[PDB]
Design a binder for these strands. Structure first.
Lengths: 186, 10, 189, 8, 8, 189, 186, 10
DNA sequence: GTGAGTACTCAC
DNA sequence: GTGAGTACTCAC
């Protein structure tokens, strides 16, 4: 709530800087927070649980808004555009957390955390499929195939954002991408 | 666009 | 001879479930069947070992991109063959795909990630050059700037590579490429 | 083109 | 003698 | 009032399977239901907490040894009652027996082990004094030196205490004391 | 065989000194051996395995000799005397290892090691029972009861040896103890 | 007595 | 909260 | 073989 949040904010700050390209050790994290390593463990059982805190924010932030789009916006193409733009803009507004989404920051941590990220992408892909299936006019392509292509474009954009040290902005080319695609998926 | 984009860092 | 046996071992480990974690010199030495000391008689560092694999990646992709440019003159066919090349190379080399996607390199000297970034730049400028020749060859361009299209195409490929790696190699990069191509072609042809 | 596999 | 148990 | 609640908590933990490992202040604080800080308002250290329990052990055993010496005048009956006392006290206080046997004290200030050694010396001299009065009271001594017999008797007791602790309290210290006594009596009476 | 043995000999040396009353850390052990902490781990997977090395010596040393007494010495009382004297003399000749036998040194290590020591005492008690049962003249006492009393005397002697900082020698009073007892178990 | 008493330390 | 530790690991 | 680390723990 307070000290617990301070620690998570410190972790996200490091993920966002150059330090995010390397292991965030308890020693470096404690120094960023301005406390001893031991103090960290009064608020979290383990570093894995600190990352889980960030992952829970990503999950809830994204899925609550995707469900809202699904429930509140009526049109198929409109729904897809909003879900895509939400993902790209969320990443752009949260560079450090994108290093978690892309899996790079998690390489240093227990693999079950990458499993959790895989589960989130499957949830997003499921939403995409459901949105597409509700159009049934038919698509020039399988709904499962299109959903996978759409999320693939997002994943590649996130990867480019991270590997470029946040130079290649994920939203930059989305309008052109969507103009091209939407003219064909009718 | 989706206006309500959460930002984790203050 | 022993140098390439070390590289072969590293690639085998990268390809297995081991590739999802740090590949230690102790583990590598064991996979090879020698002492760690022996390893360090052929390479000065782990980073130089990874550079050996990156060299194979660079030469494999760039040499074939040049071949495509030289053998095939149609713009859209050039694009299809380059995208197919990146996707199929990754599929045929799962372990090396962990290097391309950056995940296996997280444990190593950062200069290796810079090297992969440079490879992607060489690939992206290649796609840009291919796209730009359409205007002269066919008297037609594209509905968007060539720089944007090349970025979008390489991004699509990078997404396929990430999905391949995430899924522990279940989501094959070339899956449904024909359908993707048919849709892309309809968008830009 | 024949895609090369590094793993011999 | 009655042996005392400390645990009340 | 809170002081004795901390001692009660420590003894409960010593008595459970927890007693086979370090009993941390974090764990103790939790068992009590307060913060560690609260603990340190009643005791300056863990060692002083253990000293609280050792005090109960010392007073319990020594007061009863004196009672036996004062109420019972027969030498062999004195011996039987003192051995019975040490064995039954341990049985009735399993957790405190980990302190007597030294095992729970391995984690703590060494001065606590010195304190237990001093208690055993007070007990052993007591047995020696009891044995030595036989010559005047009955005009008879023993087939071995009183110093040797007292050491052997306390050693037998220490063995029972160790076995009790080793076996996670399955081997009760008083088990078959009558048979042991009958054999011992036949040896020295 | 060489470096592995050097480490075990260093551990037993520490167990035998004042350091044996406290945790033997990898830092102190390495310094005793004259190597880095990391070198220890080239010869053992864990500190628990170093202790297991000592325990294996105790087990084999004692049980091979107890079996030899059982098989080679014919008389009941003779067999008991030798097994008792073997245990006490082994302890006296190996003070550091007695801290393992008594369980005190093992308090700092994983509890499965104390389980192994319990298994050794049960093996010894079993030998004692078997020796006694073969006399059947009868004993003035149950064989199981006598065996437990005999081993109890040994255990108490070991405990006294350890807690006295090796001042109270385990063999010192054994002849008197055995003279007293043997006159009664006929 | 049992003569062959093993000694661990040299 | 924190100094000093704790067993164990890594690339060289 | 070893310096420098690694996440996590302890009593105070």
């Amino acid at each position: 709530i307070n000290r617990r949040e301070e620690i998570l904010q410190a972790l996200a700050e490091m993920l966002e800087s150059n330090e995010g390209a390397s292991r965030i050790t308890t020693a470096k994290l404690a120094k960023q927070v301005g406390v001893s390593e031991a103090a960290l463990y009064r608020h979290f059982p383990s570093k894995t649980r600190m990352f889980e805190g960030l992952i829970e924010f990503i999950e809830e932030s994204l899925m609550s808004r995707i469900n809202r789009i699904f429930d509140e916006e009526k049109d198929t193409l409109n729904r897809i555009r909003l879900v895509m733009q939400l993902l790209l803009a969320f990443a752009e507004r949260n560079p450090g957390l994108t290093r978690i989404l892309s899996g790079h920051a998690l390489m240093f941590e227990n693999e079950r955390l990458r499993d959790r990220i895989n589960q989130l992408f499957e949830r997003i892909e499921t939403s995409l499929r459901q949105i597409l299936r509700e159009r049934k006019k038919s698509f020039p392509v399988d709904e499962n195939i299109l959903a996978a292509q759409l999320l693939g474009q997002v994943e590649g954009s996130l990867n480019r954002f991270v590997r470029s040290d946040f130079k290649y902005l994920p939203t930059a080319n989305f309008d052109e991408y969507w103009a091209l695609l939407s003219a064909q998926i009718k | 666009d989706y206006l309500d984009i959460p930002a984790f860092l203050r």
